[PDB]
Amino acid sequence: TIKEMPQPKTFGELKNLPLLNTDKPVQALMKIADELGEIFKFEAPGRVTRYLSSQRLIKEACDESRFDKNLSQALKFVRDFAGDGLFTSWTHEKNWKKAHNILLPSFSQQAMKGYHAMMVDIAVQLVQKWERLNADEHIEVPEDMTRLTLDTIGLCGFNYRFNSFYRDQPHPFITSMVRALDEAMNKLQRANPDDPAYDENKRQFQEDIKVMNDLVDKIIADRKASGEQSDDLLTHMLNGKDPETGEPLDDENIRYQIITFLIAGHETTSGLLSFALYFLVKNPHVLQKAAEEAARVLVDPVPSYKQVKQLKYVGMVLNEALRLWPTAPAFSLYAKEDTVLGGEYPLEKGDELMVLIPQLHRDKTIWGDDVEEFRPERFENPSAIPQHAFKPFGNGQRACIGQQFACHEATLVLGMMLKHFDFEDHTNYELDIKETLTLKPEGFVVKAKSKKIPLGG
Amino acid sequence: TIKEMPQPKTFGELKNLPLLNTDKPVQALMKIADELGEIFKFEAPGRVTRYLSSQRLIKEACDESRFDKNLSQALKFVRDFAGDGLFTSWTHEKNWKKAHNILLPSFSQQAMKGYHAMMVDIAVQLVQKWERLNADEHIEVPEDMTRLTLDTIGLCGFNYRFNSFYRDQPHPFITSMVRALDEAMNKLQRANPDDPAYDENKRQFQEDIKVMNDLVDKIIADRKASGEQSDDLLTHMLNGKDPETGEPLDDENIRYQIITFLIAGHETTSGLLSFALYFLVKNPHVLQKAAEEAARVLVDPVPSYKQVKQLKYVGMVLNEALRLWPTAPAFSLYAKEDTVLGGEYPLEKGDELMVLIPQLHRDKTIWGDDVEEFRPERFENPSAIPQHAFKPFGNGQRACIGQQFACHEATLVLGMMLKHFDFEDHTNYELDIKETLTLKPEGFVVKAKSKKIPLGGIP
Ligand code: HEM
Ligand code: HEM
Ligand SMILES: CCCCCCCCCCCCCCCC(=O)NCC(=O)O
Ligand SMILES: CCCCCCCCCCCCCCCC(=O)NCC(=O)O
Structure with a gap:
């Protein structure tokens, strides 16, 4: 049942492009998504993309039989310094599958056990600072x-x-x-x-x-x-x-x-850790539940690999921070062939899509009415979450290769922070999200009061 | 018999003032003392002092019944920010005696034992870096x-x-x-x-x-x-x-x-530690001897107070660095009464002396003809060094209140450095001594290769 796609306001021959003239473009796109719904067309001179915000459409965009990873404009400009590295290469480039097979072993479980002492080395440096x-x-x-x-x-x-x-x-x-x-x-x-x-x-x-x-x-x-x-x-x-x-x-x-x-x-x-800490200080009951878990699990002077894998609630904190402010906040796809999205929106071969990850994560049909509330308990039963509803690490064969590395690192560091300090939001900080393609709080400051628990080599 | 002392070139009413013309004045004055000998007069508008370089005159200058600490013109300018603190007060000022009696407990044995753990905390940060x-x-x-x-x-x-x-x-x-x-x-x-x-x-x-x-x-x-x-x-x-x-x-x-x-x-x-490491990288046999002492004594993950006190050769290295480049390189005295210095230099009450410490430390009649060589063994038994021949910490009641604090710190840190690294003078550094009243090497760089000995947690 062919529907016409909504479109935000235009600037003559520049079309939608001036809507990106801001230092907060993802945040500006989320506002547009709020007004126009699950899909909108975005035009510039010589270019069209579609921004997707609902799980109903994004689950289709996530079908690799119909859509491949695209280089968004952002990734094309990034390519000037990152070339055909893994993040900015097309799936069909010979160096993509080559690098992927060669480097995949570096993120195996045996490699992770290996990295843990080095992670601990740097986390100690933070704590002692x-x-x-x-x-x-x-x-x-x-x-x-x-x-x-x-x-x-x-x-x-x-x-x-x-x-x-x-x-x-x-x-x-x-x-x-x-x-x-x-x-x-x-x-x-x-x-x-x-x-x-x-x-x-x-x-x-x-x-x-x-x-x-x-x-x-x-x-x-x-x-x-x-x-x-x-x-x-x-x-x-x-x-x-x-x-x-x-x-x-x-x-x-x-x-x-x-x-x-x-x-x-x-x-x-860095973004994830920053946002996690912001949410914890603004939600003192969740901070307390997180600190209790850290104190019960982290019983040695430094954390073991096994002990980090026991920080379930800390992991739930990190997932809820990634739900609200996924720090790589978009990815792009292209249609392999003519296809119809959602029974309603015809696409031609080569047409581009942008997944607006923070909007996906506010889809009220998935997460309920209170999508702005910080509640890590949303992740009590991960297997019950609908497919393709939670995508901070991208999709399919082009999904994040370092996802386990980042989760382990962040869980270890956050666990140690909560074991070693009480935190005060001493300025009553107002969230200001700086955009550099990626997202980070800007100007977030806190005071830490040491719990005076001895640290180890 | 009574003599007249030499004086370097004067410039009319400006006297010796234009003579220096340098950011390295102490190094200059050491050269004048080489030319003119154990004593010379130095004048500038409104002031006169006499630069002493020999143990035979300085041992008399150090007699506290005849001379007290003078504020050199240098210290008088320092006094513009340091006031009547311990370093820049006259011995007869009420604030010298009060602060001396009130702070001297902070340099007690029980105080020094208490500082050890905090010195280790900073030294561990150095080694970690x-x-x-x-x-x-x-x-x-x-x-x-x-x-x-x-x-x-x-x-x-x-x-x-x-x-x-x-x-x-x-x-x-x-x-x-x-x-x-x-x-x-x-x-x-x-x-x-x-x-x-x-x-x-x-x-x-x-x-x-x-x-x-x-x-x-x-x-x-x-x-x-x-x-x-x-x-x-x-x-x-x-x-x-x-x-x-x-x-x-x-x-x-x-x-x-x-x-x-x-x-x-x-x-x-800071100056001392820099000069000491400089002299170790230029004298490999000394470096090796010090390193072996450090390995033999510092057997635990972090140094104990007692272990630091067993590092004799390390202390000898520090003393030999202080001999050649004492980092507060002068102190000043005035005559308490009319008196004759060395049976040859009549002085009236109030007349000023400047102890030129680097030159004293190069007095061949005390140390031998090899005074420029870095040899820590000169200090094997310091009771056998003549009285007032070695004065990097000043004199008498106005001597350095922090001498043991400095010696313990520098010994600790040098010990740990020598335990944990080999050192390389990778640029073949040419000694360049920056003067800010005090003395320090400028531009001194080395490479360290870890010996990969684990460091313990801070005590
Ligand atoms: C919170 C942490 C992280 C987030 C939110 C994140 C997110 C993402 C996302 C959304 C993609 C998909 C990009 C696209 O489709 O255009 C991606 C890919 C990638 N990520 Fe991450 N990531 C994180 C941590 C890391 C870490 C720690 C590493 C490396 C150690 C890393 C390396 C990569 C690489 C190499 C790719 C490209 C994979 C490929 O296409 O072969 N990521 N990541
Ligand atoms: C190698 C290191 C050091 C050297 C070569 C040094 C040298 C000296 C010298 C030569 C004097 C006498 C100055 C004069 O007569 O005009 C002096 C006095 C002084 N030193 Fe040091 N010193 C060192 C370390 C320290 C440290 C670590 C402290 C403090 C913790 C300190 C505190 C002082 C004080 C307060 C005086 C004035 C004492 C008084 O007249 O009552 N020194 N020092
Ligand atoms: C070399 C590795 C560096 C990885 C860079 C990470 C960037 C990931 C997020 C990019 C998202 C950019 C979204 C910006 C706004 C937007 O809608 N752009 C459309 C477009 O770029 O075509
Ligand atoms: C307040 C803490 C004290 C910090 C300063 C300690 C300074 C110790 C060394 C003083 C050395 C003075 C050397 C003066 C040499 C010189 O330039 N003479 C020429 C002249 O007097 O005109």
């Missing part, structure tokens, strides 16, 4: 989460120490990364990207790409210098062979993959 | 020594965490202290200090004093707005009573003492 604050002081939450998550992927992935906790400024890599993502986001609104008004933006972009590549050079030269048997992600990038084609990755792809894993392997986990 | 460096990186030595020494006095003295190891740039207290010390030093070489052309200097000096004073306020607030009472130097400043007068220190003097202990309680110790 906060134990060593004086009575004035407060904590800058997303800044410290970025220190922890970047350092964790550096050490676990590459045996490389960013030493973020030794700098009172952001690490230079972070400064260039952030500016690069922000440039990619700002580029989304540009009708004429080659106008001279943007020459300065382009110069800065190339400088940031260079800083990122200077750091990759040191990661690689440090590994050749030592040689010593790490068996980590970087070992597999340099040595591993694809069981299908027999080939290793080439040098150019390796570099893209290092960049890829440094960024995707940390930015969104 | 160096363990976490990547293969391509290097260590900036005086920068990290300053992070360690500042943090140690902050914690032990005031229960305050500077958190220097969580910072890229130096703490702003350091930046402002360095500019203030540098201003004091430069004022010494300034013809017409009150020619309005130096108003920008005085603006900057006042701004740096304010920064140092804003930190003092945070330390006192943190102590007052914090119930968990300690028993440290600040506790005695805020509450202690002078047994003689029965009076506590007033608020103005307390503030001067905090500034004074934060500066004197770290800067020179």
Whole structure:
């Protein structure tokens, strides 16, 4: 029963494009979704996409027999520095399935047990930072989460120490990364990207790409210098062979993959931890239930791998934070062939879709009327949640490769934070979500009061 | 018989003032002493002093029945920020005696045992930093020594965490202290200090004093707005009573003492550790001997107080570094009465002397013809070194109140460094000594290779 698709307001020949001229475009799209419903058409000069918000349509978009992963505009601009790495490659690119087969073992259960001590190393650094604050002081939450998550992927992935906790400024890599993502986001609104008004933006972009590549050079030269048997992600990038084609990755792809894993392997986990902590401080009964679980399970001076796997409620906290503010908040798909979506919306081969993950997660037919409430108990019975209703890690063969890594890291760190400190929302912080493609609270600060529980090596 | 002392080149009414013209004045004066010998006169508008370089004259200068501590012109400029704190007070000022009696308990044996655990906390942070460096990186030595020494006095003295190891740039207290010390030093070489052309200097000096004073306020607030009472130097400043007068220190003097202990309680110790590591990387046999002592003695995951006291050779290394580059490189005396120095130099009451410590420490009649060589064995038995030949901590009742604190800190940290790493002078560093009144190597860099010995939790 062919329906006509809704569409937000237009700007003459620019069509919908100026609706993206904002530093909060995903948030602006959620508002549009609220007015127009489960699907809307979005036009720009030479381009059309459809934004999906209901589980009813997204479950169809998630059928890999009908839709493949698409590079959204955001990912095409990101590709300028991440190339054909795993996040920004098409599914049919030879380097996609190649990298995937080679690197998949680095996220096995045996690898995870292996990473756990390194994760603990960095989590201790966070805890001791906060134990060593004086009575004035407060904590800058997303800044410290970025220190922890970047350092964790550096050490676990590459045996490389960013030493973020030794700098009172952001690490230079972070400064260039952030500016690069922000440039990619700002580029989304540009009708004429080659106008001279943007020459300065382009110069800065190339400088940031260079800083990122200077750091990759040191990661690689440090590994050749030592040689010593790490068996980590970087070992597999340099040595591993694809069981299908027999080939290793080439040098150019390796570099893209290092960049890829440094960024995707940390930015969104920093966001998650930041949002989790925000929700916990604003929902003191949930904070208490979470802290009780941490105190009952984490009975040794440092957490074991087994003990992290026992933090069920902490996991539920993290899932509910991902429900409300999934930190990579969209993914894109293209129609393999002419098809009809939902019995109502005809699509032509190649047509593009955008899944608005935060809206999917507010679908009242799935989650009920109180979709804004922070309630981790929504995840008491994960097997009862409808298929394709909860997608913070994407879909199918193109789903997040580091999902278990990120969940383990965040569960360990959050568990230790709740074991070691009581937290005060001392400014009565008002949520301000900064967008850099990814989502993070900006300006979130708290005070921690040490419970004075001794920590271990 | 009675002699006339030499004097270097004078420039009319400016006297010797234009002679220096350098950011390395102590190094210059050491060269003048090489030329002119054990004693020379040095004059500037409105002041005269006499630079002493030999043990035979300095042993008389150190007789406290004949000479008391003088505020050199340097210290008089330091006094513009440090007031009548212990370092910049006259021996006869009521505030010297009061603070001396009130703070001296903070350097008791039982106090020192109490500091050990907090010194270990900071030293563990140092070692952890160096363990976490990547293969391509290097260590900036005086920068990290300053992070360690500042943090140690902050914690032990005031229960305050500077958190220097969580910072890229130096703490702003350091930046402002360095500019203030540098201003004091430069004022010494300034013809017409009150020619309005130096108003920008005085603006900057006042701004740096304010920064140092804003930190003092945070330390006192943190102590007052914090119930968990300690028993440290600040506790005695805020509450202690002078047994003689029965009076506590007033608020103005307390503030001067905090500034004074934060500066004197770290800067020179930083210098010492930097010079000591410099001399170890230039003398591999000495390095190896010190490393072997550290391995043999430091057998536990963290050092105990008793273990630090068994590190004899490490202490000898530190003393030999102090011989060659004592980091507070002069002290001043005045004549209590008319007297004859060394049976040849008549002095009237009030006449000033300057002990040029690096030159004293190079007196060939005491140490031999090899005085420039780094040889810690000179200090195997320090009772067999003549009286007043070795004075890096000053003299008598005005000697360093923190000498044991400094020696224990530096011994601990050097021991742990030697236990945990091999060191490489990877740039073949050429010694460059920065002067800010005090002395420090500038630009000194090494590479450390971990010996991969685990470190224990902080005690
Ligand atoms: C809270 C943490 C994280 C979230 C919310 C997240 C989310 C996602 C999403 C939504 C995708 C799908 C992208 C698309 O379809 O366009 C994805 C893919 C990916 N993620 Fe994550 N992720 C997280 C953590 C990590 C970590 C820790 C790593 C690496 C250590 C990582 C590596 C990747 C990679 C390589 C891909 C591309 C996979 C492929 O297509 O072969 N992610 N992730
Ligand atoms: C290697 C390290 C050190 C050296 C070379 C050093 C050297 C000296 C010297 C030469 C003096 C006498 C100054 C004069 O006569 O004008 C002095 C006094 C002083 N030192 Fe140190 N010192 C060091 C470490 C420390 C430490 C760690 C502290 C504090 C914890 C400290 C506190 C002081 C104080 C307060 C005075 C003035 C004492 C008085 O006259 O009552 N020193 N020091
Ligand atoms: C190299 C690994 C870096 C991974 C980057 C992570 C970004 C993931 C989220 C991208 C979502 C962007 C959504 C922005 C608004 C939007 O609707 N864009 C449409 C479009 O880009 O075509
Ligand atoms: C408040 C804490 C004290 C901090 C400062 C300690 C300084 C200790 C060393 C002082 C050395 C003074 C050297 C003066 C040499 C010099 O430049 N003479 C020339 C002149 O007097 O004109």
